[PDB]
Enzyme design. Structure first.
Site, PDB file in Angstrom:
ATOM      1  N   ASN A 184      13.827   2.967  14.643  1.00 14.17           N
ATOM      2  CA  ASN A 184      12.898   3.930  15.233  1.00 14.17           C
ATOM      3  C   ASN A 184      12.935   5.237  14.446  1.00 14.17           C
ATOM      4  O   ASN A 184      13.935   5.935  14.467  1.00 14.17           O
ATOM      5  CB  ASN A 184      13.198   4.192  16.718  1.00 14.17           C
ATOM      6  CG  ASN A 184      12.092   5.003  17.382  1.00 14.17           C
ATOM      7  OD1 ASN A 184      11.568   5.931  16.783  1.00 14.17           O
ATOM      8  ND2 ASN A 184      11.736   4.660  18.608  1.00 14.17           N
ATOM      9  N   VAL A 201      13.647   8.761  16.477  1.00  9.72           N
ATOM     10  CA  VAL A 201      14.830   8.936  17.325  1.00  9.72           C
ATOM     11  C   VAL A 201      16.102   8.730  16.517  1.00  9.72           C
ATOM     12  O   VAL A 201      16.222   7.719  15.851  1.00  9.72           O
ATOM     13  CB  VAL A 201      14.860   7.859  18.399  1.00  9.72           C
ATOM     14  CG1 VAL A 201      16.117   8.023  19.261  1.00  9.72           C
ATOM     15  CG2 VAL A 201      13.599   7.909  19.233  1.00  9.72           C
ATOM     16  N   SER A 236       2.486   1.526   2.547  1.00 10.35           N
ATOM     17  CA  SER A 236       2.474   1.744   1.107  1.00 10.35           C
ATOM     18  C   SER A 236       3.844   2.119   0.570  1.00 10.35           C
ATOM     19  O   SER A 236       4.540   2.943   1.155  1.00 10.35           O
ATOM     20  CB  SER A 236       1.528   2.909   0.760  1.00 10.35           C
ATOM     21  OG  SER A 236       0.235   2.759   1.312  1.00 10.35           O
ATOM     22  N   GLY A 237       4.215   1.537  -0.563  1.00 10.10           N
ATOM     23  CA  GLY A 237       5.493   1.837  -1.181  1.00 10.10           C
ATOM     24  C   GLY A 237       6.600   0.879  -0.790  1.00 10.10           C
ATOM     25  O   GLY A 237       7.607   0.773  -1.481  1.00 10.10           O
ATOM     26  N   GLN A 282      -2.094   1.215   6.002  1.00  7.04           N
ATOM     27  CA  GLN A 282      -1.792   2.588   5.657  1.00  7.04           C
ATOM     28  C   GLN A 282      -0.471   3.001   6.299  1.00  7.04           C
ATOM     29  O   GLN A 282      -0.298   2.869   7.506  1.00  7.04           O
ATOM     30  CB  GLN A 282      -2.942   3.502   6.125  1.00  7.04           C
ATOM     31  CG  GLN A 282      -2.681   4.970   5.892  1.00  7.04           C
ATOM     32  CD  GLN A 282      -3.828   5.854   6.328  1.00  7.04           C
ATOM     33  OE1 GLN A 282      -4.898   5.367   6.704  1.00  7.04           O
ATOM     34  NE2 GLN A 282      -3.607   7.166   6.301  1.00  7.04           N
ATOM     35  N   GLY A 283       0.464   3.505   5.503  1.00  7.99           N
ATOM     36  CA  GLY A 283       1.769   3.872   6.045  1.00  7.99           C
ATOM     37  C   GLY A 283       2.830   2.883   5.587  1.00  7.99           C
ATOM     38  O   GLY A 283       4.023   3.189   5.590  1.00  7.99           O
ATOM     39  N   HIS A 307       1.457   5.746  -6.145  1.00  8.62           N
ATOM     40  CA  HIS A 307       0.472   6.455  -5.314  1.00  8.62           C
ATOM     41  C   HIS A 307       1.104   7.181  -4.142  1.00  8.62           C
ATOM     42  O   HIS A 307       0.447   7.995  -3.470  1.00  8.62           O
ATOM     43  CB  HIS A 307      -0.665   5.527  -4.828  1.00  8.62           C
ATOM     44  CG  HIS A 307      -0.337   4.771  -3.579  1.00  8.62           C
ATOM     45  ND1 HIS A 307       0.077   3.455  -3.594  1.00  8.62           N
ATOM     46  CD2 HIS A 307      -0.384   5.135  -2.274  1.00  8.62           C
ATOM     47  CE1 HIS A 307       0.285   3.047  -2.352  1.00  8.62           C
ATOM     48  NE2 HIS A 307       0.012   4.046  -1.532  1.00  8.62           N
ATOM     49  N   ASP A 352       1.311   0.695 -10.309  1.00  6.80           N
ATOM     50  CA  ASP A 352       1.629   1.486  -9.110  1.00  6.80           C
ATOM     51  C   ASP A 352       3.101   1.400  -8.663  1.00  6.80           C
ATOM     52  O   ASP A 352       3.430   0.808  -7.628  1.00  6.80           O
ATOM     53  CB  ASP A 352       0.694   1.119  -7.957  1.00  6.80           C
ATOM     54  CG  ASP A 352       0.826   2.071  -6.789  1.00  6.80           C
ATOM     55  OD1 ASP A 352       1.459   3.135  -6.983  1.00  6.80           O
ATOM     56  OD2 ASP A 352       0.300   1.761  -5.695  1.00  6.80           O
ATOM     57  N   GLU A 369      21.353   6.118  10.642  1.00  5.80           N
ATOM     58  CA  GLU A 369      20.628   6.802   9.570  1.00  5.80           C
ATOM     59  C   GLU A 369      21.516   7.448   8.512  1.00  5.80           C
ATOM     60  O   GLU A 369      22.625   7.900   8.793  1.00  5.80           O
ATOM     61  CB  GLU A 369      19.692   7.885  10.128  1.00  5.80           C
ATOM     62  CG  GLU A 369      18.650   7.393  11.123  1.00  5.80           C
ATOM     63  CD  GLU A 369      19.193   7.230  12.542  1.00  5.80           C
ATOM     64  OE1 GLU A 369      20.410   7.437  12.798  1.00  5.80           O
ATOM     65  OE2 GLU A 369      18.377   6.882  13.415  1.00  5.80           O
TER      66      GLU A 369
HETATM   67  N1  LIG Z   1      -4.580  -3.644   3.818  1.00  9.31           N
HETATM   68  C1  LIG Z   1      -3.643  -3.319   3.036  1.00  9.31           C
HETATM   69  N2  LIG Z   1      -2.949  -4.258   2.425  1.00  9.31           N
HETATM   70  C2  LIG Z   1      -3.320  -1.870   2.796  1.00  9.31           C
HETATM   71  C3  LIG Z   1      -2.072  -1.466   2.328  1.00  9.31           C
HETATM   72  C4  LIG Z   1      -1.815  -0.111   2.136  1.00  9.31           C
HETATM   73  C5  LIG Z   1      -2.801   0.837   2.407  1.00  9.31           C
HETATM   74  C6  LIG Z   1      -4.051   0.401   2.861  1.00  9.31           C
HETATM   75  C7  LIG Z   1      -5.146   1.342   3.189  1.00  9.31           C
HETATM   76  N3  LIG Z   1      -5.393   1.859   4.416  1.00  9.31           N
HETATM   77  O1  LIG Z   1      -6.473   2.644   4.290  1.00  9.31           O
HETATM   78  C8  LIG Z   1      -7.020   2.701   3.030  1.00  9.31           C
HETATM   79  C9  LIG Z   1      -6.213   1.865   2.268  1.00  9.31           C
HETATM   80  C10 LIG Z   1      -6.313   1.550   0.812  1.00  9.31           C
HETATM   81  O2  LIG Z   1      -5.360   1.095   0.180  1.00  9.31           O
HETATM   82  N4  LIG Z   1      -7.485   1.823   0.223  1.00  9.31           N
HETATM   83  C11 LIG Z   1      -7.660   1.651  -1.110  1.00  9.31           C
HETATM   84  C12 LIG Z   1      -8.652   0.802  -1.573  1.00  9.31           C
HETATM   85  C13 LIG Z   1      -8.844   0.637  -2.934  1.00  9.31           C
HETATM   86  C14 LIG Z   1      -8.057   1.326  -3.844  1.00  9.31           C
HETATM   87  C15 LIG Z   1      -8.302   1.133  -5.293  1.00  9.31           C
HETATM   88  C16 LIG Z   1      -8.035  -0.104  -5.843  1.00  9.31           C
HETATM   89  C17 LIG Z   1      -8.241  -0.351  -7.191  1.00  9.31           C
HETATM   90  C18 LIG Z   1      -8.763   0.654  -7.997  1.00  9.31           C
HETATM   91  C19 LIG Z   1      -9.057   1.896  -7.438  1.00  9.31           C
HETATM   92  C20 LIG Z   1      -8.833   2.157  -6.095  1.00  9.31           C
HETATM   93  S1  LIG Z   1      -9.216   3.619  -5.535  1.00  9.31           S
HETATM   94  N5  LIG Z   1      -7.943   4.471  -5.101  1.00  9.31           N
HETATM   95  O3  LIG Z   1      -9.873   4.370  -6.579  1.00  9.31           O
HETATM   96  O4  LIG Z   1     -10.102   3.507  -4.408  1.00  9.31           O
HETATM   97  C21 LIG Z   1      -7.060   2.192  -3.389  1.00  9.31           C
HETATM   98  C22 LIG Z   1      -6.876   2.355  -2.023  1.00  9.31           C
HETATM   99  C23 LIG Z   1      -4.301  -0.937   3.068  1.00  9.31           C
HETATM  100 CA   LIG Z   2      15.954   6.775  13.642  1.00  2.13          CA
END
Ligand SMILES: N=C(N)c1cccc(-c2nocc2C(=O)Nc2ccc(-c3ccccc3S(N)(=O)=O)cc2)c1
Ligand SMILES: [Ca+2]
Length: 223
Positions: free
Chosen positions: A54, A57, A177-178, A174-175, A40, A84, A62
């Site tokens: 950081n 900076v 991810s990955g 958020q952020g 994703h 994913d 790096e």
């Molecule tokens: N709280 C966390 N662990 C986390 C980690 C990374 C990003 C976020 C996040 N920070 O803000 C939103 C977010 C988010 O991931 N929203 C989200 C919710 C559900 C789905 C999902 C899950 C299963 C099937 C389908 C979906 S989806 N993409 O269709 O909705 C995908 C993303 C939260």
């Molecule tokens: Ca740096």
């Protein structure tokens, strides 16, 4: 990371930042030429940033390297978030050192209750927005398959696990991810998704890396 701590510079030497003009996702260095991240997170024009603390900076350790190829998993399905995982190859090999190091792939999956290290530069608040400049860390336990399912209004596939705190307060965000979920020195997880962050009964979900080792190894061999 909500409710975590400042890692300390370069204490997580396999932590990678993906940059397209700004940080947008984490990754894990698995060898001198390959990063593992979340499907994703895919986008064109990625620059892999190694040895970061950081991210705003130039601190001295790096390595910035362009991606030469990205390979999203064949079966990644964004409506389900199933599979994913994405591999990124670097245009040149990272110089490995104490601050830039690879993380081992799992030989076996981790079990519920196992304590893991999750890290990233993601949002630090459940309500509102604050983004850190230095790398944050969170120690969380893997939660049972049954409580993971009970705590989710989406469908949970067997290539996912959840971890964190059902009480809330401590989670990735958020952020992040990955980025890595490391358990007993093995990359077991990739920060995949969550309903909001660090909310009650809304635990973090992660890609079950142990399920993908064969695909990881074979794809790297061939590219
Ligand atoms: N709280 C966390 N662990 C986390 C980690 C990374 C990003 C976020 C996040 N920070 O803000 C939103 C977010 C988010 O991931 N929203 C989200 C919710 C559900 C789905 C999902 C899950 C299963 C099937 C389908 C979906 S989806 N993409 O269709 O909705 C995908 C993303 C939260
Ligand atoms: Ca740096």
């Amino acid at each position: 990371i909500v409710g975590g701590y400042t890692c300390g510079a370069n204490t997580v030497p396999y932590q990678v930042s993906l940059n397209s003009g700004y940080h947008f996702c984490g990754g894990s260095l698995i060898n001198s030429q390959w990063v593992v991240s979340a499907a994703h997170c895919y986008k064109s024009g990625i620059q892999v940033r190694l040895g970061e603390d950081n991210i705003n900076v130039v601190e001295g350790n790096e390595q910035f390297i362009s991606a030469s190829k990205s390979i999203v998993h064949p079966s990644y399905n964004s409506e389900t978030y199933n599979n994913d995982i994405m591999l990124i190859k670097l245009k040149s090999a990272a110089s490995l050192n104490s601050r830039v190091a690879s993380i081992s792939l799992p030989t076996s999956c981790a079990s519920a209750g196992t304590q893991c290290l999750i890290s990233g530069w993601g949002n630090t608040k459940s309500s509102g927005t604050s983004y850190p400049d230095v790398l944050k860390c969170l120690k969380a336990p893997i939660l049972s398959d049954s409580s993971c399912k009970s705590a989710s209004s989406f469908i949970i596939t067997s290539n996912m696990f959840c971890a964190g705190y059902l009480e809330g307060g401590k989670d990735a965000c958020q952020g992040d991810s990955g980025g890595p979920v490391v358990c007993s020195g093995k990359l077991q997880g990739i920060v995949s998704w969550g309903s909001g962050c660090a909310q009650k009964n809304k635990p973090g979900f992660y890609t079950k890396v142990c399920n993908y080792v064969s695909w990881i190894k074979q794809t790297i061999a061939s590219n």
